Ligand binder design. Structure first.
Ligand SMILES: CC(=O)N[C@H]1[C@H]([C@H](O)[C@H](O)CO)OC(C(=O)O)=C[C@@H]1O
Length: 679
């Protein structure tokens, strides 16, 4: 077996189910006996077949169907390999979901993939579109030379008992088979030749997070486009984990993005890049004692030009599912104050309050203590800043070890080792900025209005809304949802963000996930679209600036799952087909978060008044990729040019099989021409 390229083929069209034989290639004899090596190939799949082998080498004879090696892709964008010589001898597998795509902007596109079988390092590595996807370490290194009775080298399928299995359909742009193991750098470079859309936040950036979720995108009146997202450090798990809120902006219409910042973050647990295990056991493990911020909402007050960032604030070890029932506040002298528990009192004895100027009072004696908190809620004892040891987290097999380090961080009321601990329910936090993110204000916990009977009261991630016309012109609104007297809710402000008022939009006590986004009608009335626990997206209308809302009505014609997925709906500044238009994004499949689509809805005046004044005709739908390709949370934004920007999760964020995937938050842009099927 010579050193270097053993075989190369270009521009091979493969009819679905036919495959293509490489047995007469000069180097087939070498490829059939490879002890290690590298395979790199460019392809365009035109088939919807479940599993599609790109390249294979094996035994095609009767009874030898489990004797082969193949690199394959799935119609859902997964990619992987199977190295087999019957299960009793060996069955090595490696894969990663949502690694490749099929369609981009209405046309089938090429993807570049690579498999590296490194004998010297006893390791197998998969790459695709500039990314290292997965790694397999085996003490008993095996390759093609280890398969019994190899008799074929095939493109577009795997020969099993004389039949073409895992049938590919499309074009193999180029395939190169090397006897040697190329470097990871060479492969990142080689496969990186085909990329689609761009990343704002990514694994390796200054956030020090390997994972991201929950996108927020907003174009400011100044033309600057801003964005935010959960920077999920301990895998992609929801709260009761270590999560911070990342932020970035673009001053060139979304072409390039600034070095990300972390406006909302906690330091009780270190922020670091860690590969979370994806095996059947480890994937379920999450960080237990860390505080976190989760689900961002961005909003601009066009009058003052001030921007706001809201997010749920989870005390140490808390998430929505394990939050305690209560507001977290106590009323004294008619005023609500954040309540605290001295670490040496009874488990549920919150006999202290944070009052004016952060001074902590003893409620029993009604006298101030020697403690106080600053604008960041960090503790001070007699004007000295208190501190505690920061925690680190590492896996020891399938067990996640959370241990204290020697690093001192400021003691915060939301940390597990604080001497004064906040009530274990969730809070609503916010910071404002008058310089587009160069600096942010102190931490403002606006949830003093949280019903004492509620388990959780959280935000509907995405963007907020400011009424532009009518009697309530200027009012700021942020969507909320909860497990309490109401499900859907909202908080609004008439004094440009200084103070907020809570509104219950229904009387549902089930606590279903009613994440919503708000859109304004021509006369200033509002229509809110929301996720529900039923098989449809719901619509509610308000004619009094969000103070009262109509009963839910299903959004007819736009399919979804029972559990649902967050959606994005925005106003568009110019008319489409001569009418006011709103744009909606959401996965369209009835099972699984996949088949994402962008819809354009035209506003019609029915001729009636009040709640029934307007009707929306969802005239256009745009499919982002093929039907099985993953698509979850998203956020649309009208860019300074006519375009519509989209920051979304390109995978299935609900699936227990697609957890902990890096670089799945993508940014794409589309013209109204594209969106309306007008090419
Ligand atoms: C605060 C919080 O936990 N938010 C999470 C929310 C929630 O858990 C709910 O009950 C519905 O699943 O769900 C999801 C989700 O991908 O489905 C993402 C959010 O980040």
């Amino acid at each position: 077996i010579p050193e270097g390229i053993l075989m190369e083929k270009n521009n091979v069209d493969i009819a679905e189910g036919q495959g293509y034989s490489l047995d007469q290639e000069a180097g087939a004899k070498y490829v059939k006996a490879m002890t290690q090596g590298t395979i790199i190939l460019s392809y365009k799949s035109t088939s919807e077949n479940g599993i599609q082998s790109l390249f294979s080498v094996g035994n095609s004879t009767a009874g030898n169907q489990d004797r082969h090696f193949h690199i394959y892709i799935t119609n859902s964008g997964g990619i992987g390999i199977e190295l087999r010589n019957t299960d009793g001898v060996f069955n090595y597998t490696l894969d990663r979901p949502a690694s490749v795509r099929a369609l981009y902007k209405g046309e089938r596109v090429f993807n570049t993939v690579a498999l590296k079988a490194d004998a010297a390092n006893k390791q197998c590595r998969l790459f695709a579109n500039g990314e290292l996807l997965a790694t397999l370490d085996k003490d008993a290194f095996k390759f093609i030379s280890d398969i019994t009775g190899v008799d074929n080298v095939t493109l577009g399928g795997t020969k099993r008992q004389g039949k073409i299995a895992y049938p590919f359909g499309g074009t193999i742009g180029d395939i190169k088979v090397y006897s040697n193991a190329l470097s990871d750098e060479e492969l990142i470079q080689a496969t990186g030749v085909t990329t689609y859309g761009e990343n704002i936040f990514y694994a390796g950036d200054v956030t020090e997070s390997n994972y991201f979720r929950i996108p927020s995108l907003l174009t400011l009146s100044t033309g600057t486009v801003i964005s935010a997202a959960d920077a999920r450090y301990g895998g992609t798990h929801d709260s009761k984990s270590k999560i911070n809120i990342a932020f970035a902006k673009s001053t060139d219409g979304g072409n390039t993005w600034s070095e990300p910042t972390l406006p909302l973050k906690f330091d009780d647990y270190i922020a670091k890049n860690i590969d979370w295990p994806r095996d059947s056991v480890g994937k379920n493990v999450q960080i237990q004692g860390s505080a976190s911020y989760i689900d961002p909402v961005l909003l601009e007050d066009k009058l003052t030009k001030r921007i706001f960032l809201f997010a749920d604030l989870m005390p140490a070890g808390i998430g929505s599912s394990n939050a305690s029932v209560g507001s977290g506040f106590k009323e004294v002298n008619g005023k609500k104050y954040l309540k605290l528990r001295w670490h040496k009192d009874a488990g549920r004895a919150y006999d202290y309050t944070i009052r004016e100027k952060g001074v902590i009072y003893n409620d029993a004696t009604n006298q101030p203590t020697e403690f106080r908190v600053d604008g960041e809620y960090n503790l001070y004892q007699h004007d000295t800043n208190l501190t505690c040891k920061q925690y680190d987290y590492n896996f020891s097999g399938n067990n996640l070890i959370e241990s204290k380090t020697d690093v001192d961080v400021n003691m915060n009321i939301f940390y597990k080792n604080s001497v004064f601990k906040a009530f274990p329910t969730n809070y609503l936090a916010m910071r404002y900025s008058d310089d587009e993110g160069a600096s942010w204000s102190d931490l403002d916990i606006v949830s003093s209005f949280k019903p004492e009977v509620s388990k959780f009261l959280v935000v509907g991630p995405g963007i907020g809304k400011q009424i532009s016309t009518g009697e309530n012109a200027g009012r700021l609104l942020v969507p909320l949802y909860s497990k309490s007297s109401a499900e859907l809710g909202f908080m609004y402000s008439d004094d440009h963000g200084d103070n907020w008022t809570y509104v219950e939009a229904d009387n549902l006590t089930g606590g279903a996930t009613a994440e919503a986004q708000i859109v304004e009608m021509p006369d200033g009335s509002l229509k809110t679209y929301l996720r529900t626990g039923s098989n449809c997206i719901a619509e509610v209308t308000s004619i009094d600036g969000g103070e009262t809302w109509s009963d839910r009505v299903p959004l007819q014609g736009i399919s979804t799952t029972s559990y649902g997925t967050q959606l994005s709906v925005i106003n568009y500044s110019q008319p489409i087909d001569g009418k006011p238009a709103i744009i909606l994004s959401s996965p369209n499949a009835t099972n699984g978060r996949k088949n994402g689509k962008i819809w354009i809805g035209l506003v019609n005046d029915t001729g009636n008044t009040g709640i029934d004044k307007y009707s929306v005709e969802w005239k256009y739908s745009y499919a982002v990729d093929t039907p099985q390709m993953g698509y979850s949370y998203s956020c649309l934004a009208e860019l300074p040019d006519g375009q519509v920007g989209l920051l979304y999760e390109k995978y299935d964020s609900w699936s227990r099989n697609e957890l902990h995937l890096k670089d799945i938050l993508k940014f794409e842009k589309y013209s109204i021409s594209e969106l309306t099927g007008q090419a």
